[PDB]
Amino acid sequence: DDFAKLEEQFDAKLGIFALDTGTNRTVTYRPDERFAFASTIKALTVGVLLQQKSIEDLNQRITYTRDDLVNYNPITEKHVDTGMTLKELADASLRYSDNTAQNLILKQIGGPESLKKELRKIGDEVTNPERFEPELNEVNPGETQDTSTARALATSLQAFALEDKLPSEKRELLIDWMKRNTTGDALIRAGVPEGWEVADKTGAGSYGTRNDIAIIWPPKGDPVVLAVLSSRDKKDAKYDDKLIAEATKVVVKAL
């Protein structure tokens, strides 16, 4: 088995769920195994934001201080004095994985508990958000806090991006931001053939957790929804992006 060999090569545990929405063909490997979701939660968080906010609501300017800044603020740290609109925060969260942006958006939808309730409402009984960034990235073996599964993350991404959980213009917004992600060049994007379009959100967490969730479009026909999650034995383990790229190639061959 190709996934098993990847786990051996990269000394990592893999979680895979892929669905061809045109055929209902799937590729799965430990699809119900829990992993820390890390920054991938940012995608579902914008999903819920878009359920609740009108387009003009996204123009609201959010003021914050140097004190609101956490550990990874590539865009937010450059706009303390002027603030950022919710739309700009969504852009920074999704495309740069800006942690302060995620936190500010989280507050707008009522925090982790509210995020969890809204995910439960769309049929996600698995994803378990409890914390803000960056604390959420740190999950110990056996814990379910701030974890989900490949199946549940893929299904929730599918719900917001492809299904009627959002109206078409809002689905388009989410997809456009994700298509233009800056952080995923070495992951799912690196494992698809030429001509395939990718809308992804990455994550990295403790125990060398390295994730990417995506909608991918072949040149012709219906989109594929894919979650590729991974973790390792040691708390301070480094990850290798190639694991995700190679796992994606396996999924592409199998479909």
Ligand X SMILES: *C(=O)C1=CN[C@@H](C(=O)O)C(C)(C)S1
Q: To the nearest whole angstrom, how small is the minimum distance from the Cβ of residue 96 to ligand X?
A: 9
Q: Where are the beta strands (DSSP E) in the chain?
A: 13-20, 26-29, 34-36, 61-62, 84-85, 147-149, 197-205, 209-217, 224-231
Please indicate whether residue 135 is annotated as part of the active site: yes
Contact pick of 129, 184, 203, 208 for ligand X (by CB under 6 A)? 203
DSSP assignment, residue 184? -
String of b and e for 233-253 (b: at least 16 CB within 10 Å)? eeeebebbbebbbbbbbbbbe
The catalytic residue among 33, 114, 130, 135 is: 135
Strand partners, 84: 62
Q: To the nearest whole angstrom, how small is the minimum distance from the Cβ of residue 111 to Cl ion?
A: 21
Taking the least distance from each CB to ligand X, the nearer of 43 and 162 is: 43
> Which entry of ligand X, Cl ion, none binds 99, CB below 5 to 8 A by partner kind?
ligand X
Contact pick of 73, 97, 230, 231 for ligand X (by CB under 6 A)? 97
Please indicate whether residue 97 is annotated as part of the active site: no
Q: To the nearest whole angstrom, how small is the minimum distance from the Cβ of residue 242 to ligand X?
A: 17
CA 223/CA 20 separation, integer angstroms: 6
Taking the least distance from each CB to ligand X, the nearer of 3 and 132 is: 132
Q: To the nearest whole angstrom, how small is the minimum distance from the Cβ of residue 42 to Cl ion?
A: 8
Residue 148 touches ligand X, criterion: CB under 6 A? no
Distances (CA, A) of 73 to 76, 79, 89, 116, 205: 5, 10, 11, 24, 17
> Which entry of Cl ion, ligand X, none binds 71, CB below 5 to 8 A by partner kind?
ligand X
- Chain residues that interact with ligand X, rule: CB under 6 A: 38-39, 71-72, 97, 99, 133-134, 137, 203-204
Q: Which residues are known catalytic residues?
A: 39, 135
